[model samples]
Target: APLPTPPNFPNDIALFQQAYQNWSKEIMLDATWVCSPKTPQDVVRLANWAHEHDYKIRPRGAMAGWTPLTVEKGANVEKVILADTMTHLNGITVNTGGPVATVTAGAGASIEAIVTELQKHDLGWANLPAPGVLSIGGALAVNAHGAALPAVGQTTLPGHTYGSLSNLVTELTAVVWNGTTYALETYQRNDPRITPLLTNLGRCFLTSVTMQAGPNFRQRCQSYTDIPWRELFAPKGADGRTFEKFVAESGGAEAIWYPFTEKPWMKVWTVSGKPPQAREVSGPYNYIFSDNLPEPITDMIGAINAGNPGIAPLFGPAMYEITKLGLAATNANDIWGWSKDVQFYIKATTLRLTEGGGAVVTSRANIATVINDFTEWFHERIEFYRAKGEFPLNGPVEIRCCGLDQAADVKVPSVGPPTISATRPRPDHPDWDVAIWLNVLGVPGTPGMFEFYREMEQWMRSHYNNDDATFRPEWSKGWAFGPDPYTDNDIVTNKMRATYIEGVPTTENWDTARARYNQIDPHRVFTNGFMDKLLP
Candidate 1:
């Protein structure tokens, strides 16, 4: 059954009825008129109506994104409906006979649900970050990922790192926006531009997804006694030990710098052909990522280790509210298949580098220096911050490797013409590799974190020439930053304008499929800030 209607809220009214609903807006509104439409046709009707009436819509799930991607902005913005996809993840399966599944999930579906459900069938995703309320659509949108580095055990994110997340998608159904309509279709491999759509933001949308989950792959996560940072991150000769290959093989990598301590505990889980290895460590258990645990365990361990505790104890409550939809209303694991004994959070970040591209901060940072320096700096900073009582309570930093994608929005827009060809620099050559630092804060709620993150994000855009088309954040935690801000960043004013500002179609072929939405929402009555942001 669909969730009960949410209470009428004044904040929702302010946000739902206005136009300044973007995360950067001065006055934000609470979620109101939260319509929990449960079926594809139900969504179609709402989309048609919003478009016809010129009302703005904010599609949401778990109401968890940080940027207000699902929140309303102004009076012009009305109706914050739940185009929930959580239910869609259900009803899908793969490899029963071979590798394929028709997953049904409402927008409310969480990452835990997808992973555990697949596990039940003795199947799992090819790669996955940490557990969270991350919906498949959300994961695909931002290119979610986790640790994958030194390419060694205890050095990278939690999952495989060889291919892009979009590569896992076999097909999906999207509710896209054209200047005039909303169209839904089950995508196949017949189109030329399908890859771009897989990670699209509000411009083109994915209301539902059907992914080709992988076999039940496992990795034995363990800690190490010693790590020679230089030797680990040192530039290698042909076929010598290197972080690059480690990530390619393990699918993810992560490294953490202990606050106030030279010891940085690194945990690595790779695609294991064998069962989990059992080992003991001197330190007590810790849960950095939010997961269900008693408050004391949560607080004490939180005090000792500030990063990469897998699932933090605090996360359990937040998830308790969401798991009921799976109709298993008690513990998080009861609803999903999270382990009862521990809590862990996983995080991943991607970076791109260019050599001799331009005088514009276009030069990529040195790969060897970036990795070694980051790990070392993190170790130093942890001590520095801990002494100051400002330790960041988040998961440890995880590193993963991915070749730069050929997406358009990924190119620096605003800095250059938007029409330049997709030419990405390689990370292996000198001054050519891009390295992204992926970290997770263990705090249950980051105080002013959303605001600070956005500002920092803009700063990165200005300095590094990055945007949503390129930044791959961890899958499924609350993120409000979408693809637009980078397009609006200051770097565009610098030189990217020559590369990403012109000759680009506001709507592509799949975007043109808005006709289907027009059929269901003829008057375009169901609308929101995103529709206009995307169409006009």
Candidate 2:
């Protein structure tokens, strides 16, 4: 027999009138019920009610990214509930009275909002993703990061490092279940069960998170367009001008290598307390490119996609010209400002594109070898496709690196010391503190792009398939192994599971985390079809 709806549930549904909403263009759904709860108690009430009615709950804010991690597609609308947290739950508060400064925020609060609030109190997150629009809940859920140095400097605050936003969590409040009842619960970051929950893969709903923050500081961003890929990626010899040397000197850098072009557009930053030497900007830098594309360049891009594949070589140089000109035109080429002011600049109206990226962890000494090998494979693949009259990629291949997730940095009360993070450094490879991130982008529906991504994914898996170095999916990006979206490729799926979940150094315990989650959600009220397959 079908489960009976709990008393008062029908009447409560009437309070929420919005039928459904999805921010990303990729997935669309009409939820049977959508509620914006104002407090933790309200969330608990909704979760328990869903449990009694045998429906799954998805909590969302901004709903950014291509993955269907937040929304349940293809499921009966009557059996799903969308909890919109950004409506009324967005609030931020800072407490610097303790040993460590921390920011306690609502799950709905966007990173930009949080940063703005913290700046008033002279505090900010050490490292943050480019787009400040991401909700604290969403950023933590995906373990998002930015292009900041891994290690903290001499002037760095006691409680700061360039690690995943997930690592900043010191405490969290969520609506969890006991053996017999569901209620609002609070857990310290050190709790044994908190490891997997830190980067929760849509397993449970969060009300608010208390994350460690640092004192506000100024940053200087400098752009260089003359560095050739060979010199930038070359092995660090006596002179020390390579990418590795750059990171060591400046402590924060990112390299953007445009396809079919020779020189990469590199941006390097350093802590600045005085007036900047370069052109000063007032806001985030991403908007310069995000605002609008000139008609000429737009036509060129369209022509490439419209079956004129032979124009790719010319298109590459054209992009370089645009980037340089746009930055100069918008006064975004060189800038300096408060960390929050400079870091949170991505706009929602930016042109939408498909992305495939991952975090490749290896020792600092092997950075050159990794870059050399990957770039060689990438260029080779591009040439192979060009031979067949195909130009699958038009956007730059973005490369950034950062320190591993050092969960031990955050202190929290617990029975046993916390274990490795979801993206933590391997226990056996203590020397491996850096993660080289690679991202390839292109317009949506670009032909042969998906197949091209698959080839790259396969190469990464085979090359980094060991304890010394390894790869893991960027939680918020694509990890599919084929041209079709949502298609199951056992080879890729199992490899991902083994590499991250069941790998050596014994980082994650799938069975323990799974059992704990099931214990708190025996009715599976927080799960969906995608999660059931991915996590189980």
Candidate 3:
């Protein structure tokens, strides 16, 4: 039976049916009803309808997450409504008159669209995720981040941000169930009630937000695919080119290491004017080879996917070779561009793969420790699977670092740091200032992949659990892979809930966030199966 429609739903908003495909195409929900709200007022009406009609409403945009935060597995058998924000809820406006430059935009807008608009006014965001296709709401829901570390001596600019998008967003207007009915209410950055909504994980339906912006500047990005892991990740004071060196010398840096490979591809971004040796790029996606499938890459995938886990060992070297070849072929080895151009390197056209990501919140001193230790463990773990003739993973291990969420960095009276963000600050420990994002990409449905993921998940949780530092699963990525997979009671029920309460005060703990979720949506209109289990 289909969901019961409201008695008199709004005539302006469109409601229809469609299939939803996540990034990995793992959770392909078959033809489900979706609602397209043209404006915030439309959302308020939809929320009221969903609340009164006893239906579920999950806010959706881009649909890029690994997990089922938007539409869960059992959505087909239930009365879940997807409020699609991408259609008619996007708008952007830059305000330069205020003491601090800001941009007011609709949540459905893409970061690329907003950034492009800001660039015209000689302004831009301090940090942005690598991909530009994500809707602004999508990025905020997951607390998307960027590699925005500063050189030792470089002072932060006016709109500078060292962490996730949560910090950049200073004001938000969301449609929530008011005391008697659903209403669209605006909240300031300093309002304590806005803490959880900053990264509500689809638990709140947001229509628009305001973010800080700064004077637009150029960045020079230099790529290096020849640096060996042993040298780059070597312990501090090794007296050679190391990961620490690039991070300290450049405004931003990231390294991608393929399995069973020695040299990792590293990209360094520095704040500067175009130099003599660099090509000044006018836009993003400089590495064309990375977007679409090349001959050898497709061939390799075919071989690995067909009953041949034996050939998985060859996958690493194939990618390592291609990384170097592609860099040379495009001459994208060194390029200069605006912040928006240099920051977003990957595009939606890039190959889609299932990724499991986790973060370790530590200090600057432990940067090498986290990266070096994890790479070693990853290699040894893969070898263990090889010894048993069961290849679990055949993908690159990516590493990116960013400063922790610093509410002070906002320089404005804001509520955050976010309570549930992966990089949310440990208010007690001021010195724990950096976050290391560790991710492993895997071929979906690969034999032994879940088991492999399970091992890595527990290992990270055990190692990073501490007073000074801790581990948090990426809200949008895959985790909690226990013997039963997604329903891992230990993760979803206990430790996951424990992460938000440890150093936080009672008034603003995990329980507080969950309470707010229910307070705003007592009818559970903005929740899915997984969201209920994870937050309840």
Considering every candidate listed, which one attains the maximal lDDT?
Answer: 3
lDDT of 3 by residue, 406-436 (tens): 8667867876677788888887887898889
Ranking by TM-score: 3, 2, 1
Error of 2 at 280 (Å): 3.7
Colliding pairs, model 2: none
TM-scores of all predicted structures: 0.57, 0.91, 0.97
lDDT (Cα atoms) of all candidates against the true structure:
0.39, 0.72, 0.83
- State which candidate has the highest TM-score: 3
RMSD of 2: 3.4
lDDT of 2 by residue, 216-239 (tens): 888877777777888887854634
- Candidate closer to the true structure by lDDT (higher is better), 1 or 3: 3
Number of backbone collisions per candidate, in order? 129, 0, 1
**How would you encode candidate 1's per-residue C-alpha lDDT over 1-536 as one tens digit per residue?**
23233233222122222222322232355434544455665566666665554444545544334333454344323334545456442334433433244344443456666666666775554445454556666666655543433233433222222233444554667665545556676655344435455554443446666555544544445433245444455552324344544454553444443222222334444443333233322111123222243454446455534553333223323322222222223222111121211113422111110000111111223344345544554455444544665534333344434333223212111121111212232222324323354343333333333443444344333443342123222322322232223233333233233333222444532233343334434453444453434322
lDDT-based ranking: 3, 2, 1
RMSD of each: 11.3, 3.4, 1.7
